[PDB]
Structure formats: C-alpha cells, structure tokens
C-alpha cells in the first residue's frame, strides 16, 4: 500500500506483483491441458461403451465442447497481455538492480595536501572510492499483495532523479584558504530531490554538503509502463483465464445443453429441443441416477467408469483392447477412434 | 559477428536474436491452433460423413491425433524454456538501459581559484552525476544458424574511473608535481566508466596538467546478467525445441510422413481391416489406395480432401426441431461437440 523505497524492495514488489498474473495464468494452461484430455476421454468412452454407458456420457459432450472453447478462448486472450506485462515488468527489474548498485553513491575523491607544500601527485589522493559501485546483495529480511489489493497499489517507486556533487573542505577549521594542511573531499551521490545546501556550506565547508545536484533519471517510465501492463490485463478481464474445469460438475450442470441432452438420453425423448420438454422432477430424478444425487458421483463414479471404458489397442499379432485410462494418450485414443468406427464400418 | 560495443547495440542485438526463438514459438502456438481445429473436424466428419468419404477420413483421423499430440509435447518442452529466456534477457536489456545512460560518464567538478578560498563560485564545472538523456542513434547476422557462432554479449562497464587534472600557474600552463597549487590553478576531477581497468599515474604525476585516469575501481552493473540471457537461449537450442509444433495436419507431407497413416490405408482403403503390420500389403497397392483417396500423392488433399471434409452435413439445435448444415458452416468446437452427441444418440435410437 505505501510506496516501494528501496531498489532491492520495489524489484521484490514489482516481480511478486507479476506472479499474481503468472500463476494464475499457468493454472489456465495445465486447466486447459486436463480439459483437453478430459474431452478427448469424452468422445472415446462416447464411441466405445455400452448404451446405458453411453446415455450417461452424451449430456457432458456439448457442455465440454463449450467449456473447453471458452477456456482456450480466454487463454488466447491473456496471452499476449501476460507477455506484455512480463517483458515490461522484467526490464524495470533490470533498472532497479543497477539503482541497488548506486543506493550508497559512488564514492569519493580526498585529496590531503599533506602538509609542507601544495604540491600534487597521486599519492595525496588518499580516498580514490570514485567510481565503486554497491556490490552486496540485498538484504535478507525487507516491506498486501493479491489481485484484490491491485487496484489502488501504487506505481513503483523512481528512486534516483539526481546526483549530487557533496563537498568537505577543512584547513588548517573552515575554509581560511586552502593550505597545506587542507582536507579537500569530492563525492557523488544520488536521491529523488534536488539538494543545494550551499547556504549553510560556504559558512562551514567543513561540513560534508550536497553543494550542487544534477538531473539523473534513471528509470524514466519504465516503472509506470510496466505498472500500467500489469492494468492492462485486469482492464481485460483476463487475469484467470481458464479456471473452469470439465471434471466439475458445477461448471457442467449449469450449460442449458446439458440439461437437453439428459431430457433426450436419459428421458427417452430424442427429439426434445427445449428444456421444458421434460418436467423438472423428472430431469432431477434423471440426474441423480445418471451422476449421484445432484452429481454427487461424478468424479466417483461416472469418471471413473469412463475411464474404465474397454477400447481397441494396436499389437502387431492382432488388435488387443484395454481401457482408457490405461491407454491415456491423445494418439491411443484416436486410434481406438478409428478403429472403432471402422468396426462399424466393417 | 564482433562482439557488441555500445549499449544500444548491445540490447538491440540480443532483442532481435531473442525474437528468432520468440517468434517460431509463436508459429507453434498458432499451429497447435489449427491442428486442434483440424482434429475436431476430422473426428466430426468421421462420424457424420457417408462411407465412402469415412473410409478416406479414417486414415487422417489416427495421424492426426498423433501430430497433434506430438506437437502440444513440443509446445510444452518449449514453454519453460522461452519464458526463462524472455525474463533472463529482458532483465540485462533493462540493465543496458542504464548502461547506455552512463556511457558519456558522469561528469565532472571544477574548481578555479587571485587567493586559494573556496566557495561555490569558484567551481565553474558542476557536471558531476549528470548522466547522458538522448535516445539511441538511428551494429551484423541474426539468425537461429548463426547462433552457434554468437558471441557472449559484452559488459561494456567494467571499471569506474577517476579522471584528473591539475594546471597551476597563470595560463594554467604547468604540472602540479612541480609548480604548487596557487592562485591560478584549475582542479579539474571527474568519473568516467570503460570495459578495462587504467592506472596513469605514472605519467599524471609527472604532468598533472593533462586529463589521466590515475585510478579505477570495479563497476560490473551486468554481474552475469547478460551471459546468463546468451545461456538461455542456448538452452532452448541444447533442447533442440527452437521450432516446436511446426508440423499442420494440412499438411499432407506431414500426414504421410506419420507412422499411424500406412497401417489405416491398409485397414481401412484396401479392405484388410484386421491388418496390424504394413508389410501386411504391397507398398505399391497403399500408394494406389492414397493417390485415389487424396489425389496422386495428395495432390488433392487441400482442394479436394479438405473441402469435401468441411461439406459433412451435421446435426444442428435449433429450437423448433433438430436441423442439419454442413461443418463449415457451424465451424466451431462447441457446435461439433454437440454435433456428436447427436450424432451417437441417432445411432442408439
Ligand atoms: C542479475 O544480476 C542481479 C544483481 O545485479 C541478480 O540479483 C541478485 O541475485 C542474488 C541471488 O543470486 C541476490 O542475493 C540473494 O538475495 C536474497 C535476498 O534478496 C531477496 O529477498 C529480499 C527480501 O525479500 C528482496 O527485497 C530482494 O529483492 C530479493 O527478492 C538473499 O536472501 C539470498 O541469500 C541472496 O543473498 C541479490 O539480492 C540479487 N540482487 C538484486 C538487486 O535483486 C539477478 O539475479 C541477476 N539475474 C539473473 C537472471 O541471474
Ligand atoms: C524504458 O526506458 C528506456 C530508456 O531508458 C526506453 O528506451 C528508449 O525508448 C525510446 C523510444 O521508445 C528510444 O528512442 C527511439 O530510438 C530509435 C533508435 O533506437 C532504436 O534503434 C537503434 C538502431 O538504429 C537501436 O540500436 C536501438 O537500440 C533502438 O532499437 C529512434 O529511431 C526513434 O525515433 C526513437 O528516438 C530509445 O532509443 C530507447 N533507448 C534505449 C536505451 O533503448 C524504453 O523503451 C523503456 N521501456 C519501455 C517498456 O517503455
Ligand atoms: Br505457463
Ligand atoms: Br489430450
Ligand atoms: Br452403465
Ligand atoms: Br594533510
Ligand atoms: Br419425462
Ligand atoms: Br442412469
Ligand atoms: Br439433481
Ligand atoms: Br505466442
Ligand atoms: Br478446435
Ligand atoms: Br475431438
Ligand atoms: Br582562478
Ligand atoms: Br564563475
Ligand atoms: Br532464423
Ligand atoms: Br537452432
Ligand atoms: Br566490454
Ligand atoms: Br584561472
Ligand atoms: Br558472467
Ligand atoms: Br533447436
Ligand atoms: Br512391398
Ligand atoms: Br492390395
Ligand atoms: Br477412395
Ligand atoms: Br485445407
Ligand atoms: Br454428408
């Protein structure tokens, strides 16, 4: 809720933030991977068992079809949003782990003038940190987040607009000329404000002060675009793409073509076309004998006996047979397909 | 290809190498699209079509539930391997941003001195912290061949530099090592940044009034950003996944050329159902069977196969009775779906 300050917090934040989308987008892609499986079981087990089996499997048919198109519809839709997000996030990332290098500023020049002469070489250059970025890592222990929290989190934080030229100059006491007992130090550092402490300085340089700062924006909007993509995919609509699954008979036993088909399969009344063909009770009654009461049963039983569903199998002495879920790959099941209807056929 | 040499360059470079993997992935993505396309329409027809046309179809129907498989394991290998590289290389192109607005250094104070006080005004150069803002200017082979030969991206910063200057004496004319610093000197310190480290000590110290970096300290931004980016798209080439799913049931090169496809021509084209091994037919007798069904050498298979696969009729819901119309024309999943379940309770009725 508060800002990120720290380059190693804010990269933390802005990479969390991503996986709320991330994760939920890979939960759509292994959805859609059962979903397909679990249609392909469908039409198999359909083609392959016995009529009191199959006017069990015909209802789920249309509702899979319908689920399984909507789940891949909307995982088409996520996924150049989630791409998008990504590639922003990861480049802000990349700025914000050379902003850790630069959080301590990047050292010093000291000359000590030693003190018989004004003379110079490089060995009254006693501080040479010039130049040394921050190389440890960041800090084990640093800092709400959830797709909830996403719509007032605020942008990540810039950090760094600008460099600052801190000076000490210290003789003899203030600077009093400079002379040969003279501490002169010049430094960098950076913030998110313009320092000029000029003022106090000039009384007492003595004193390390920020004497005059530079423009030094390093982030730019990378941070605000990257923010803005992780928007962009709730705008859309598209942060948990893929969450219904065909092996849940709530997602099941609400599509309207369901309820059809147990009036038409399951009711002895094929040429039903309107879900008031059938009296209420009886398409209740209907149901709880085919799937459990109110589906109870479905991944009990009626799962489970889809998939134990006897179906052809390829063998060079001869065409063997064994279930679905013994043979569970999509070329197994195509091929009992085939086989199945060329029986028909033949 | 020489090894990057500017920031630009450098992140430019390995976006556009990224994009090689990036894009060929996004082929299979679209081609799994329409081989699962290609498969629900030949399971329909499958069921629906006449005789004549299922004996044709069966054939496509067992090849193409093994391509499409084959090329979902493809996508699936692929996927992790795409998305660490991706997230590997747009994190060092976020440090090259950095890199590219230091790589006109830092800046610099000067201080010019009538007494030796100091105060502001006397430094006439400020410049220190102020890092370059222009946009890149308006760089070599890509390509997934030239790949192997690719060399590791470069790190261009290695080393921070403090530049110095010294010219004492009016006309700021001499060396501080021997003409002290009073009245009229310039002192002149700045940070600078290079792929290498410098000591010119040696010579500053005998003719301070020259520009010397007379000493470095490490500034490695990168770390192993970079080479750890080059890695990962060596790893999705080591999994040899850089054209995952490029095969289209379409295609019928690519039908042809699966190991399921002889063995139903034979069973389903020349009357051995019971067949189980190829040799259980003459070759030349399945070369037959396929130049009649899908045209010589498939010649037909997208004018002619294809199109008469799409004309199937098949049922369709329609609330004042069941009506029919052809695969193309209700060209989607969840009317083939319902399609089917149709189709097997005409059959048990
Ligand atoms: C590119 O270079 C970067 C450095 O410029 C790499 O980042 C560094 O990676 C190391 C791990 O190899 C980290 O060291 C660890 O740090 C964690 C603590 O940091 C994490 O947790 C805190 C607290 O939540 C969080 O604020 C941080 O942002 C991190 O999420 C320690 O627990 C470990 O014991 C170990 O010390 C560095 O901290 C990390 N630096 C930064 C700035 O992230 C980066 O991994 C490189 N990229 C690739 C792809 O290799
Ligand atoms: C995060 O901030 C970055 C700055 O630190 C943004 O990068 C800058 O984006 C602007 C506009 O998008 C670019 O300006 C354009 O530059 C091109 C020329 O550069 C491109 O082409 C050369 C080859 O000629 C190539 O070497 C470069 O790498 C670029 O591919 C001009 O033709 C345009 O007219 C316009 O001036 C800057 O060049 C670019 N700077 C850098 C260092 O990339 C970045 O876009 C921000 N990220 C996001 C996600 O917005
Ligand atoms: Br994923
Ligand atoms: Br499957
Ligand atoms: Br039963
Ligand atoms: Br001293
Ligand atoms: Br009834
Ligand atoms: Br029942
Ligand atoms: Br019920
Ligand atoms: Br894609
Ligand atoms: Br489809
Ligand atoms: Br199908
Ligand atoms: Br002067
Ligand atoms: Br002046
Ligand atoms: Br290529
Ligand atoms: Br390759
Ligand atoms: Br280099
Ligand atoms: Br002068
Ligand atoms: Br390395
Ligand atoms: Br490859
Ligand atoms: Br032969
Ligand atoms: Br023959
Ligand atoms: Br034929
Ligand atoms: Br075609
Ligand atoms: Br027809």
Same mark, same amino acid.
């Given at each position: 809720?508060?800002?990120?300050?720290?380059?190693?917090?804010?990269?933390?934040?802005?990479?969390?933030?991503?996986?709320?989308?991330?994760?939920?987008?890979?939960?759509?892609?292994?959805?859609?991977?059962?979903?397909?499986e679990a249609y392909s079981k469908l039409v198999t087990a359909a083609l392959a068992a016995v009529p009191t089996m199959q006017r069990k499997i015909l209802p789920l048919l249309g509702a899979a079809? &319908?689920?399984? &198109?909507?789940?891949?519809?909307? #995982?088409?839709?996520?996924?150049?949003?989630?791409?998008?997000?990504?590639?922003?996030?990861?480049? %802000?990332?990349?700025?914000?782990?050379?902003?850790?290098?630069?959080?301590?500023? #990047?050292?010093?020049?000291?000359?000590?003038?030693?003190?018989? &002469?004004?003379?110079?070489?490089? +060995?009254?250059?006693?501080?040479?940190?010039?130049?040394?970025?921050?190389?440890? =890592? /960041?800090?084990?222990?640093?800092?709400?987040? @959830?797709?909830?929290?996403?719509?007032?989190?605020?942008?990540?934080?810039?950090?760094?607009?600008?460099?600052?030229?801190? %000076?000490?100059?210290?003789? @003899? $006491? $203030?600077?009093?000329?400079?002379?040969?007992?003279?501490?002169?130090?010049? @430094?960098? +550092?950076?913030?998110? !404000? !313009?320092?000029?402490?000029?003022?106090?300085?000039?009384?007492?340089?003595? *004193?390390?002060? %920020?004497?005059?700062? *530079? &423009?030094?924006?390093?982030?730019?909007?990378?941070?605000?675009?990257?923010?803005?993509? #992780?928007?962009?995919?709730?705008?859309?609509?598209? $942060?948990?793409? /893929?969450?219904?699954?065909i092996t =849940?008979? *709530?997602?099941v036993?609400?599509?309207?073509?369901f309820?059809?088909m147990v009036?038409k399969a399951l009711?002895?009344?094929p040429?039903?076309?309107?879900?008031? =063909?059938?009296? %209420?009770?009886?398409?209740? *009654?209907a149901?709880?004998s085919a799937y459990g009461?109110?589906?109870?049963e479905y991944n009990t039983k009626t799962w489970k006996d889809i998939g134990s569903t006897r179906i052809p199998k390829?063998?060079?002495?001869?065409?063997?047979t064994d279930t679905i879920d013994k043979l569970s790959?999509?070329?197994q099941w195509g091929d009992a397909i085939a086989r199945l209807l060329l029986q028909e056929? +033949?």
């Amino acid at each position: 809720n508060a800002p990120c300050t720290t380059a190693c917090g804010c990269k933390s934040r802005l990479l969390k933030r991503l996986d709320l989308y991330t994760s939920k987008y890979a939960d759509g892609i292994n959805n859609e991977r059962e979903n397909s499986e679990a249609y392909s079981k469908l039409v198999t087990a359909a083609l392959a068992a016995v009529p009191t089996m199959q006017r069990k499997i015909l209802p789920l048919l249309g509702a899979a079809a &319908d689920i399984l &198109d909507i789940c891949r519809r909307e #995982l088409a839709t996520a996924r150049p949003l989630v791409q998008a997000a990504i590639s922003k996030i990861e480049e %802000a990332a990349g700025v914000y782990n050379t902003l850790h290098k630069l959080e301590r500023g #990047l050292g010093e020049a000291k000359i000590e003038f030693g003190g018989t &002469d004004l003379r110079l070489t490089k +060995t009254k250059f006693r501080a040479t940190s010039l130049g040394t970025i921050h190389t440890a =890592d /960041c800090p084990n222990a640093d800092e709400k987040i @959830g797709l909830e929290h996403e719509e007032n989190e605020p942008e990540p934080a810039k950090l760094i607009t600008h460099g600052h030229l801190d %000076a000490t100059c210290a003789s @003899g $006491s $203030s600077c009093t000329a400079v002379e040969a007992n003279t501490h002169l130090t010049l @430094g960098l +550092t950076f913030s998110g !404000s !313009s320092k000029d402490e000029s003022a106090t300085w000039n009384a007492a340089t003595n *004193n390390k002060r %920020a004497i005059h700062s *530079n &423009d030094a924006d390093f982030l730019g909007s990378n941070a605000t675009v990257a923010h803005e993509a #992780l928007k962009a995919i709730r705008s859309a609509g598209a $942060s948990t793409p /893929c969450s219904s699954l065909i092996t =849940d008979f *709530n997602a099941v036993r609400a599509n309207p073509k369901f309820k059809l088909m147990v009036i038409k399969a399951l009711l002895n009344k094929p040429t039903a076309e309107k879900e008031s =063909d059938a009296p %209420a009770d009886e398409v209740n *009654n209907a149901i709880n004998s085919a799937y459990g009461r109110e589906g109870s049963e479905y991944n009990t039983k009626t799962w489970k006996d889809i998939g134990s569903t006897r179906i052809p199998k390829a063998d060079p002495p001869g065409e063997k047979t064994d279930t679905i879920d013994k043979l569970s790959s999509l070329p197994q099941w195509g091929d009992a397909i085939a086989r199945l209807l060329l029986q028909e056929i +033949t």
